[PDB]
Every structure is written in C-alpha cells, then in structure tokens.
C-alpha cells in the first residue's frame, strides 16, 4: 500500500483559466498513477492513465505529468462542465486514491439574505419548537452562523446544511434550525440568528420578538 497525498481539496476556478492538482506518493510509484473525474450522479470516468497517456475521447486541455513521487494534473481551460472532483489513483502496488479536488466556480463575493422563522404553531402542539433561519445566496461558501436566545449563545440543537452550488447563479445557501422543547421555547421571547460572513465586517443579526410582535 502507499499513501497518496493530494491537494488542494476545493479549488475555486474561474471559467476560462487553468487548475493544477497534485499527488505526492510515499514510495516511488514509477509513473503508474491515473486521474479520475467524478461528478454527482455518475460513476467515476477515467481521464489519463500511466501519468501522461490521455484517454480516447478525453480532451487535450487535460494534461498529466510527473515522475518519482510527485505528479501534477492540469486543466488548461476550465470549462463550464469540468466542475467535478478529481482523484488520482496509484496502482504500482495495490491501489490508493488521493482525497480529491472538488472544483467550484469562483465569482464575486455576495452577501446572504437572512430570514428567521418562528415555530409553526403545529410544531408547538406536537410539543416541540424548531426555530429556522435561512441564509440564501452568498459567496464564498464560508459562513459562521450563531444562534442566540436572549443574547445567550446556544450551540446544541443547531442543525446546519448547505445547498450545492447553484448552476445558474453560483452562490450557496444555508438553512439553520434550532430544535428545542415546547417548554424551553415558551420560557424565552428573543431568538437571534447571527451570520459572520466575509462580505461584511459587522455580523448580520436577525431577531423576531416571540409571538406578540
């Protein structure tokens, strides 16, 4: 077995420029390394084998190079349609893949439109309360959202999931839910959602005054 470090993971590429992925091995692997492309939805498509030998049908903007342990993968023209994860794969002694480069398209920074949502009444009658704060359309991906009760930072109960990068806008959105029991919820009034995002120095805070407005 041989370890294979590959870097970066995440590359923000601009459509029109080049990307250079790298896999460095633990032993000399003698140019037996391959490069795969893995989009969502399908199984991995092989691109290059034995370091430099392109595949039938694979474009020459993809290029591969390297020799001992060091090897590089290069896409001269990142095309709208090369956004996938690339894994390298030695096979000089059994098989080992690199962690992969996830590519995403780099674009202007954009700030999130935050919304906070109270518990729906129907959730309360069930005995629970999830407060849900949407953070829609921003860039870059990084957003750190804090949940606060009456100025009190609560961190458990928080569930977070992000959208995939939207094909026709290239932003990311996030959802943040704070799941609390009916009782905990009824004993507090202010609930605050606080996004700390690169686009603005000051945190984006949003609060709703419980029920009475």
């Amino acid at each position: 077995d041989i370890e294979l470090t590959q870097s970066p993971s995440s590359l923000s590429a601009s459509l029109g420029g080049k990307v250079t992925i790298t896999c460095k091995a633990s032993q000399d692997i003698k140019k037996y390394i391959g490069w795969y492309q893995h989009k969502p939805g399908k199984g991995p498509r092989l691109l290059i084998h034995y370091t430099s030998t392109l595949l039938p049908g694979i474009p020459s903007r993809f290029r591969g190079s390297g020799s001992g342990r060091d090897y590089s993968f290069s896409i001269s023209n990142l095309e709208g349609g090369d956004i996938a994860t690339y894994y390298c794969l030695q096979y000089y002694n059994l098989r080992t893949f690199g962690g992969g480069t996830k590519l995403e398209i780099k674009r202007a920074d954009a700030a999130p439109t935050v919304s906070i949502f109270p518990p729906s009444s129907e959730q309360l009658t069930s005995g629970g309360a999830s407060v849900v704060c949407f953070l829609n359309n921003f860039y870059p991906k990084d957003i750190n959202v804090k949940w606060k009760i009456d100025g009190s930072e609560r961190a458990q109960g928080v569930l977070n999931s992000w959208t995939d990068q939207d094909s026709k806008d290239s932003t990311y959105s996030m959802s943040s839910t704070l799941t609390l029991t009916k009782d905990e919820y009824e004993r507090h009034n202010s609930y605050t959602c606080e996004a700390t995002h690169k686009t603005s120095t000051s945190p984006i805070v949003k609060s709703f005054n419980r029920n009475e407005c």
Binding site: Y36, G43, P44, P56, P119, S120, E122, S126, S130, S175
Partner: protein
C-alpha cells in the same frame, strides 16, 4: 453491451452482515479482476480489494481485511462483497469495476449500491409551514419555507406550489437528527406579501405512501 449490474439499495440494521453483488454481463468474467471501491459521503474514494476470477487470488486493503469478504460465483459471473459488523460508518455507495488493461477505450464501473445502515424504521415526515410572522413586511420579497421534519428513509420530494413555484427553490440536503432525517426548502416570490395563490408545499415520501400539502 458490457454492463456491471449491482444490487439495489440495501437498508440494514447495525451489527448485521450484508452481501452486495456485481453481475458481469457482456464480456468473459475470468478476464478481468473485479475491484470494489467505497464512496464516502461528501467526498473521498477508498479501495476495498479485488478478486481475480481467473487465477482466483483476492488482495485486500489492510484496513478492510476484517470488514470485507470478497467472493465470485464463477458459473453466473456475479462477484459479491460481504460486509460484516455494519456500523453507521458503512453508510456509503459501494461500486465494483472490472480492471482496465493497457490502453483500452473506456473504464467500466458498476452503478453502485447504497447501503444505509441503521436501526430505524419507516416513518412519515412531519411537515411544518414557515411563513415570516409579523415582522413589518412592508416591502422586499417573501421567502416561504417548509420543514420536512423526522423521516426514514431518505427519499422526500418537496414540490413547491404543485410545481408552479419553480422560480428559485433552494432545497437543503437532509441530515440526521436523533436517528431520523430532517430537511427543508425555501421559495422566494417577487415582492412582499404572498397571499393570493395558496402557495403550498407538497412533500411526498415514497416508502410509507405520504403526500402532505401544507398551504397554510
């Protein structure tokens, strides 16, 4: 033509053992070794091992030696991998692929089997409406949401406004909360004040038979 056809989703309880297949049609099974490859949620690929149906040697990733058992039913060209002691960490997509020799045209991968491993049973989703409350509302747009809370297994389709509101629907991937899955979506509609067409989110969960339409 050459196909490697894999077993359908295996849903299974922790501690158990699963056996997943790779039905090799369209070529001579003994020619190529079958490798199995593990596909990790969010990112990553891990080689498990290979069985060569020709000379019969199997070689495993050291890391998988105790977890996986690789086998082939030569008479029917179906190679199977068995996974013993399923923890929640073996939730994943598993793939088999026939080896690629020299400079061949294309590399043949199976469609993969998803194994979601757990002790939970089918549960219809609890749907709740999300509408902005009394926060002024004298402008901007409006974003409406629906919280698909607590279901098993994954498969929930949240159609907005019975399809009408395709406009900008964000649908956030489901994550595990206390043993079940929670998920949500959002639509933004043009300016303030949605009350005209009763907007409605409609979520369906196949394994159950559930169709909830929360409008208000």
């Amino acid at each position: 033509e050459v196909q490697l056809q894999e077993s359908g989703t295996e849903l299974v309880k922790p501690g158990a053992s699963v056996k997943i297949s790779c039905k090799a049609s369209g070529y001579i099974s003994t020619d190529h070794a079958i490798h199995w490859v593990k596909q990790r949620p969010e990112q990553g690929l891990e080689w498990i091992g290979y069985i060569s149906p020709g000379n019969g040697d199997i070689k495993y990733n050291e890391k998988f030696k105790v977890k996986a058992t690789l086998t082939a039913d030569q008479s029917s060209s179906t190679a199977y991998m068995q996974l013993n002691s399923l923890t929640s960490e073996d939730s994943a997509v598993y793939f088999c692929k026939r080896s690629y020799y020299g400079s061949s045209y294309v590399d043949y991968w199976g469609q993969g089997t998803t194994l979601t491993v757990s002790s939970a049973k089918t549960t219809p989703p609890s749907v709740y409406p999300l509408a902005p409350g009394c926060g002024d509302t004298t402008g901007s747009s409006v974003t409406l949401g629906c919280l698909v809370k607590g279901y098993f297994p994954e498969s929930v389709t949240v159609t907005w406004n019975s399809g009408g509101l395709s406009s900008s629907v964000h649908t956030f991937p489901a994550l595990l909360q206390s043993g079940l899955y929670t998920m949500s979506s959002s639509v933004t509609v043009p300016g303030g004040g949605w009350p005209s067409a009763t907007v409605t989110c409609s979520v369906a969960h196949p394994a159950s038979s559930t169709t909830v339409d929360k409008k208000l």
